[PDB]
Amino acid sequence: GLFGAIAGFIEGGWTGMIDGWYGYHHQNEQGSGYAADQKSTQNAIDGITSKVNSVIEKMNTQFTAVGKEFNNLERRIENLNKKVDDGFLDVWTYNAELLVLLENERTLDFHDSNVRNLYEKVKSQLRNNAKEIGNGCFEFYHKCDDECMESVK
Amino acid sequence: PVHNCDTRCQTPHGALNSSLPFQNVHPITIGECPKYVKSTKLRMATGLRNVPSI
Numbered sequence A: 001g002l003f004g005a006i007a008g009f010i011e012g013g014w015t016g017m018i019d020g021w022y023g024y025h026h027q028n029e030q031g032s033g034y035a036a037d038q039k040s041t042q043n044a045i046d047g048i049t050s051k052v053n054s055v056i057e058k059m060n061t062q063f064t065a066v067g068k069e070f071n072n073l074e075r076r077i078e079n080l081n082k083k084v085d086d087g088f089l090d091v092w093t094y095n096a097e098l099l100v101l102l103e104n105e106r107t108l109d110f111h112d113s114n115v116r117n118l119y120e121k122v123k124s125q126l127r128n129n130a131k132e133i134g135n136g137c138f139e140f141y142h143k144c145d146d147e148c149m150e151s152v153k
Numbered sequence B: 001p002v003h004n005c006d007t008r009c010q011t012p013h014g015a016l017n018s019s020l021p022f023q024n025v026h027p028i029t030i031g032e033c034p035k036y037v038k039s040t041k042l043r044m045a046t047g048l049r050n051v052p053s054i
């Protein structure tokens, strides 16, 4: 399910941000922003890494398999052999394609949930003195410097 | 033709050197080889929707 954040109420991503997937953009008295948030992206990296390693280690490697031989009077067993091999081949390719096609929406909704939760945290600890304006920004009724920027972060 | 490297997987169309769990070349393998399938593209996403800003 599309949680609403990526390409939703928040516009598209940022080119200038480098070292992460989730960051902030501050405009205090002496600078501009583009700093990452190393907490949540670390859990994201660890979850996706465990995901890919699990998907690798569930599929078993196959050992030696050589095609066999038959004379002209054993056509029945040969047709049985061909039916066996094609049936197993179809089952394995169906399982692989279906596994990838579910895993893709799983990870995209995972990123969407990460964006929305990181937004709700910043809103919830700025419960009055913020003045939200649109597409995930705040405008700070009091004065703030870099110290309270990192105090938010 | 026959040459003298050393692999862990062997097919009639040549040798394989990988660690991916799936395989596309030929369904007759000797050694320890990834599993043969009948597809073309198994790209798996680890990341975000690349939406550029305007």
Ligand SMILES: *[C@@H]1O[C@H](CO)[C@@H](O[C@@H]2O[C@H](CO)[C@@H](O[C@@H]3O[C@H](CO)[C@@H](O)[C@H](O)[C@@H]3O)[C@H](O)[C@H]2NC(C)=O)[C@H](O)[C@H]1NC(C)=O
Residues within 6 Å of the ligand: A147, A148, A150, A151
């Ligand atoms: C999360 O961010 C807060 C932001 O308030 C961090 O607190 C601040 O940490 C800095 C670390 O350099 C402190 O700055 C320096 O502290 C030394 C030692 O007292 C002092 O000599 C310097 O003049 C300067 O103040 C700062 O005191 C501290 N507190 C405040 C109110 O800014 C916090 O450490 C960060 N991490 C965590 C896990 O909370």
Ligand SMILES: *[C@@H]1O[C@H](CO)[C@@H](O[C@@H]2O[C@H](CO)[C@@H](O)[C@H](O)[C@H]2NC(C)=O)[C@H](O)[C@H]1NC(C)=O
Residues within 6 Å of the ligand: B005, B006, B007, B017, B018
């Ligand atoms: C099979 O492929 C792997 C992955 O590329 C090779 O492993 C590395 O290959 C590079 C370049 O050949 C070497 O510099 C590294 O030392 C290799 N790493 C290890 C741990 O051996 C591997 O050499 C390839 N083997 C064959 C027979 O082609």
